[PDB]
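Minutes, project huddle
Topic: does the predicted pose make sense with acetyl coenzyme *A bound?
PN asked that the exact inputs be recorded in the minutes so nobody has to dig through chat later. Recorded below.
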Amino acid sequence: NVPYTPMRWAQDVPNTGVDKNTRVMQLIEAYRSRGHLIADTNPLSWVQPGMPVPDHRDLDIETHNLTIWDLDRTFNVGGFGGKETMTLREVLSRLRAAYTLKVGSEYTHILDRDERTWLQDRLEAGMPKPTQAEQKYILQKLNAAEAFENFLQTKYVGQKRFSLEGAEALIPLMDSAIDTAAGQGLDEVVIGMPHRGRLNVLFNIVGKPLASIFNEFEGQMEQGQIGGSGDVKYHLGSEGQHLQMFGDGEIKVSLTANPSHLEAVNPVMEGIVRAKQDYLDKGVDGKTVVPLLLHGDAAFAGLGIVPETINLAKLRGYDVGGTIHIVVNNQIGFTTTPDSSRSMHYATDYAKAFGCPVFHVNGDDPEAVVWVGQLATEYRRRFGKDVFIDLVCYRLRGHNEADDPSMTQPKMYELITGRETVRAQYTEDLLGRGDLSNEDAEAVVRDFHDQMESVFNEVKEGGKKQAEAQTGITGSQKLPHGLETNISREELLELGQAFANTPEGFNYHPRVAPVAKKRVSSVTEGGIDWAWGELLAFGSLANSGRLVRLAGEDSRRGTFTQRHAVAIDPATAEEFNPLHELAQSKGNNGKFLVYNSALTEYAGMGFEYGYSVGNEDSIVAWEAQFGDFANGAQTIIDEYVSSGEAKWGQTSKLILLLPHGYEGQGPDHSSARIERFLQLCAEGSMTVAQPSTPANHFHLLRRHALSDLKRPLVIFTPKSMLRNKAAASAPEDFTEVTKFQSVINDPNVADAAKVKKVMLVSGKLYYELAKRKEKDGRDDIAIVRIEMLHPIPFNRISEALAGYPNAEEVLFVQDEPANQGPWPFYQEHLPELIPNMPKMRRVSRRAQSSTATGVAKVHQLEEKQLIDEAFE
Amino acid sequence: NVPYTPMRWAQDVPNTGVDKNTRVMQLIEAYRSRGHLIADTNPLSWVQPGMPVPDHRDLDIETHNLTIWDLDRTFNVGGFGGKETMTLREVLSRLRAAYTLKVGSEYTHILDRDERTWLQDRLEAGMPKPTQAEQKYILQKLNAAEAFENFLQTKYVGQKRFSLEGAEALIPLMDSAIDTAAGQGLDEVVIGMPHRGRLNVLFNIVGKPLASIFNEFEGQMEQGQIGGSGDVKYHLGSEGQHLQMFGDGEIKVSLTANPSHLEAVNPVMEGIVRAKQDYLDKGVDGKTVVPLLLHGDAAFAGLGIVPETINLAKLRGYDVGGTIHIVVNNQIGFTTTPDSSRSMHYATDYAKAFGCPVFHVNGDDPEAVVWVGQLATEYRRRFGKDVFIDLVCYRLRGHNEADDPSMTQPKMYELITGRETVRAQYTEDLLGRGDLSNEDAEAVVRDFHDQMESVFNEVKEGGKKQAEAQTGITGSQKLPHGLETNISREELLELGQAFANTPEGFNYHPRVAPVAKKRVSSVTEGGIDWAWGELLAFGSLANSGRLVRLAGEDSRRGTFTQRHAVAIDPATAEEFNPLHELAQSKGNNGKFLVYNSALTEYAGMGFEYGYSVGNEDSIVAWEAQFGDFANGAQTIIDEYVSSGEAKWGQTSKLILLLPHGYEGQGPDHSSARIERFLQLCAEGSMTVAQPSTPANHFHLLRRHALSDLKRPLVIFTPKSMLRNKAAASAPEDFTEVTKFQSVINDPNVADAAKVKKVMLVSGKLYYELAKRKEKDGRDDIAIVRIEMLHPIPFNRISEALAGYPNAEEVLFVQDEPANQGPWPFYQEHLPELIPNMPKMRRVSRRAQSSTATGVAKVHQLEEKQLIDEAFE
Ligand SMILES: CC(=O)SCCNC(=O)CCNC(=O)[C@H](O)C(C)(C)COP(=O)(O)OP(=O)(O)OC[C@H]1O[C@@H](n2cnc3c(N)ncnc32)[C@H](O)[C@@H]1OP(=O)(O)O
Ligand SMILES: CC(=O)SCCNC(=O)CCNC(=O)[C@H](O)C(C)(C)COP(=O)(O)OP(=O)(O)OC[C@H]1O[C@@H](n2cnc3c(N)ncnc32)[C@H](O)[C@@H]1OP(=O)(O)O
Ligand SMILES: Cc1ncc(C[n+]2csc(CCOP(=O)(O)OP(=O)(O)O)c2C)c(N)n1
Ligand SMILES: Cc1ncc(C[n+]2csc(CCOP(=O)(O)OP(=O)(O)O)c2C)c(N)n1
Ligand SMILES: [Mg+2]
Ligand SMILES: [Mg+2]
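Predicted holo structure (tokens), as shared on screen:
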């Protein structure tokens, strides 16, 4: 059992052509670059049958024209090993000790010279010898891991737990990293992980009490929100503290909630870290909250969310100082082996796309694992980049504890069954080298078992409760009754002037200058448009002292060239952000931050959801280029935004701004899918709205920000109505009207006793119906608008209908096809809530498999047909 | 304007320590590895202000301790340039000519030695000098590209076209690749691409007639399906032929349809290629259909679907022999620059994760572009791997033709406005070197303009039609009236015996052997379960002579250990596929292929959709591990499966198998989201079903395969009912019952005149209600099952209800919450279709924000409450 190729027999060759010193330097370069291909990193003696084996002929001395006859000759090596001269025997010895034992390293692809040199120097010095106290501490942690697993196996046989047996070195690796961070003087560590070994990490790394875990297994579950539905035990989070064992440091440790969908926690935990860093406010030399992210081998290579999230690492609004990644490589999926899972040689090969180092380590050598953890945390602090660790290990049982893995992998489980564990091997090694006594070794086991037995007995004394029905979360948070959302006239004029107070030699571009002038004049003369209404809301909130963040694709300028939140000078390329300047000059330390995202919907929306969880007092908004591209983030909408409160008691106030409207631009630029969002709503989980005037959009945003109802808000924003002059607002609507309106009654009814038809509408189709009513002179019609879709404002609709006592018909008019839009939701729910209302009649486009037509002339013909049908 | 650093002044150094020959070899290695960092590949003199600049100190002779005083000394170079000895002046000259001009190359990261050597030899030989005929052919193609763009600009000013101006070298690059493939003797080329330059590619590469394109712009659109909705002009496909200009070869060229969602065509076009290759059947040395895939720079770096699809390249059921990728790098998104779009240095850096070569080429040197196209197509044919081309160019106008790019990028558009085009520059170069006359150069322009003017005038003679309403696609395909789907008794016994005809020294695993015995005995005694029903269907179809493909996560064994389509011997690890063996021994050349996918839902489902489009006569099925993970493929469901026929006239017969059932395993293992699928249905777009017996599943699958209705099928499959003994089927149900049943009436009604309540149910909740009816002895109840959900079988439901003439109530009973499951769809539609039916009453779980509870005791309490409510 020796892992190297034997030395071969050959004749001595002459020193002609390429010199032999050149050949020895080429050998040094080969080991530094490709020596990981023959390193002892696998605990099993296993080669997977269907995977390609890379060529490694570069690592034998024959390929470089050297022979056994050169081993005692001396050569110039140019500073290798801190020496100018050396023998080929000593060169080979050093190379093999550094690059072919229990740690394999990839770092030669890095472009910067100082980075490469730092890693090279530390890997060739070697791992320093640990003290006896340190060695005993590693043994305590290994014991805890294995003992906990065995206890659960014995007391709860059938129950699913997802064990860590085979990979118990993870616990001392994570401990090493957290301890190193505490010594650097940092503030917090945030963890995200999957199912494999979660209950072990909660107890041994985070510090969740043992009583809690035992209760979970007996069927008593901790309640997150009053009347909540809940979730399985391996999807929950917790908080704790970690004290340094051989030091005076202390750090905080947190673990985040997640669903079963793998790798969906990656963008969410990055956002939590960024929000925490921003609150501490320590600058570029800060970055004092560390992200620690765990993966599995099949998931890391397969799912596309992983590289999509790593691509945000060095961008302006997303940087968090680097991420430490750990891949638990146990050489198996569920019933699938690596030959069917990836087309890369290693699972961690995405690192080479981003220019980052990789360390592969044997999971049956605990002292090497502790060294790699320390080295990774030091690299992050110095260079501010991502680092990847590959922990090679195995899975002792099946995928779960009810499965038989021999049916599909017979030969692999001949090697696994009946091995000795990593705790047993390490105890034998320490007693052999005389580093531990037998009394000590036996105490370590006895003490921990007594602790667990004690707690278990205490938990069984208390009787088990019986099942009870779950009520719901509708009334678990209060509504802001009697809150006023208007600003003063002085405040409005100051916001307007921000666009006139340009810096010293700044000028606007000629096509942007008219927009700025209109903003300064409109706050006294009238004609405020949609974009200016939105910015007035965010600006007012930043003045009071809040952090406002807006992110999305092309969101600084606007997709429809409407926003201009940051302006650029054509002559010098200088930038200007008016509303941020005004906020910083009022002495409440408010901020307005606008960022242009990368081209992603899954990672984008996930990052903003996380920001809202990490700072409860911030105002965060994500914008989509068109609302039709939000189906690329369906996982986040379904698993986090719509359902997080009911499952885990985790609350959010994220704002989604989704453009919507039927204007003839085709099926992928027409519908944000209102029907889908209204399906997900129940128990008052989120607010859904489609306003028709800038002032009403202003009041909606301010009500959300100043209330104490911590639930999301989904708004459907316009595209063509952005520049419609019938939709503009007057200053009195921002300063004298006090509240947001959920139903707007018709403002052009002469006599209410002559009305015989009521139309209900939502959005931009109002302005067409109104136009036609004026032209034809109809005094028997009244058009009523619905601005808030969920919850249903049934008291207001009832009040409006009651104001027309001679009405015989009610029509519901929409632009969307009959199987889309708000009609399906309203035809089900509204008749129950208003019993005395006449039967409703739909007027819409016909039902369709697609969203809209692709021909523009057909669009115009349909619109004419629709409006004609409404007016008899 | 010289691009190199000047030679510096220094003293001569002594030849001590590391020898100077060693230093010259290190310089050669540096240029081969990192010389692309200083190559002349950018047409503009532009450096983006916020992007990091890599260190390239390795490429100057000072860092290797050499000086101007060494330039005329001679050194040993070890075969470089086919010489044993050389001067430092000649070495530098050759390195700079090979690695620093108009082509930059990355290939040193490749692990195989023979690959590296092949590339190295071809890049150092250089580009061969082209003939005069070849040169004139390149000028014709450049002219065509630019001329077409200018014509459309002039005749249709406001209209959106997404121009290729700035990147006209794409047309000769694509032409070079297709021409090289025709010379190799291959069969077809399949293209997928986005919006940028689509109408140009349709006319100049594929061969779509010019009349068609002009008509599109005048508002006359070609119809795909009778009564279809349509789509915008830059989303359509076409077919054509390509004849070799200087050869006797011929090849077929195809372009595929796609939506606006970027990069969603990547898995779909890979599947089309695989299906075409399988039909030709030429073996491992075949692979004679070439995939050619075009991208943009922002999309390639940002979206996660790109690397997810490249990861399928070398897997067993997905390999297509390599893909040629072209990235059109025009240094801008919409209003976003590379500093805000990626954290990689180049957009094509994913190549280094997969071990593939990259070529960067200047888009203003057309002869170099034609060489790189040829070299890439040769590499694919020899090594069977992916290859990446980065075409560096610019965008002359805005994102569309209505946008002003100076508002956000002032300095970049000072360099662009008023340049001379690539056609103009090339004409000037050829007239300078005397390779073309002026008469020739003027004819090239005049002839092409005359051609276009002719066609345009002909198109305007015919009058323009007026708009007309679109009818729908419901009746555009026929239903299979009077088709019988039963097999003979002889056929059933033969299928059973397949599991007894093991190979010579094969034995089953002890936990798989009982399943095999039961399969052999059940075809004569009874008790056929769900999995065996499914396999009997697929086997029967493979016997008749069809290619059957089944793919999904853990689909060979089954997620619930139920299928066992391939078995493994514990002693030798040999594999056995019974139903494939039987099919190949009947002389119709049928196949049963089962594959275990990688861990992806977006790329998985997309690949199977593509397979169904590329071979209309195959039976393809995709399976999900649980139906709750299908929201990861929402883009494919919404943009291709649900809506492809109505938009493009593209038909498919894909089968989705989605597990579903409420059994207490929590919110991410309970619901496949039936309500979402029933929203997407209209105009008879697809079939949705939830059967309750194995025999009925058999008949459904066979009806779909033998009919002429080319639409998808979505089935909701069980989890616990897989092993329920009340649900098993008898042999007569496969051989004497002729058709699939859409409604199954109650089989335990003694007297029909005593019934006073009818319950409607779908799925596994039948077996609980039936149980309770027997126990309590209720003869006033009748339970009726609905097996097909869409379309609604309203004639059968009416017939069933009419059979109970004294009924007073109808109850609709489901397990799902009230805002989920089939109730929302049925409460809207069924009362209209059956006017005389009593008012329906819902019995279900309460409405919820999440899918299901996380506590198991609460699940059991809810189920009891539900069944009690049903029975008064
Ligand atoms: C979904 C969420 O975010 S929380 C909703 C929780 N409650 C429910 O779902 C209960 C069922 N729903 C209902 O009874 C009704 O739909 C109501 C009461 C919410 C609204 O019906 P109406 O009375 O017709 O609506 P109206 O617009 O007059 O609202 C009444 C008050 O509720 C407030 N309100 C209503 N919806 C919201 C909301 N989403 N956020 C904040 N305040 C709200 C209004 O500001 C108003 O306050 P006021 O006292 O200052 O006038
Ligand atoms: C959705 C698709 O893929 S095709 C939809 C095309 N048709 C429509 O949408 C019309 C509207 N729908 C209807 O009129 C009704 O729902 C029907 C006629 C389709 C079915 O209603 P019922 O008559 O109650 O159902 P029933 O099960 O008896 O079907 C009658 C016949 O249609 C056939 N059929 C019904 N649905 C399908 C289907 N999805 N695929 C194949 N055949 C079908 C049955 O096999 C049967 O044929 P038979 O005469 O040989 O026995
Ligand atoms: C998005 C998604 N797809 C599929 C699944 C189903 N699933 C659960 S575990 C698993 C295997 C995971 O393998 P690996 O990442 O190696 O984890 P290990 O069990 O080895 O820790 C799969 C496919 C899932 N939970 N989420
Ligand atoms: C999935 C998706 N997200 C967003 C968009 C909106 N969008 C259309 S074009 C575009 C810019 C694409 O940039 P690039 O890939 O460089 O294309 P180019 O315009 O340079 O050809 C964006 C974000 C889209 N069509 N699809
Ligand atoms: Mg694994
Ligand atoms: Mg671009």
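Observations noted during the meeting:
- Residues 211 and 468 of chain B are 22 Å apart (CA to CA).
- The two ends of chain B are 92 Å apart (CA to CA).
No decisions taken; revisit at the next huddle.
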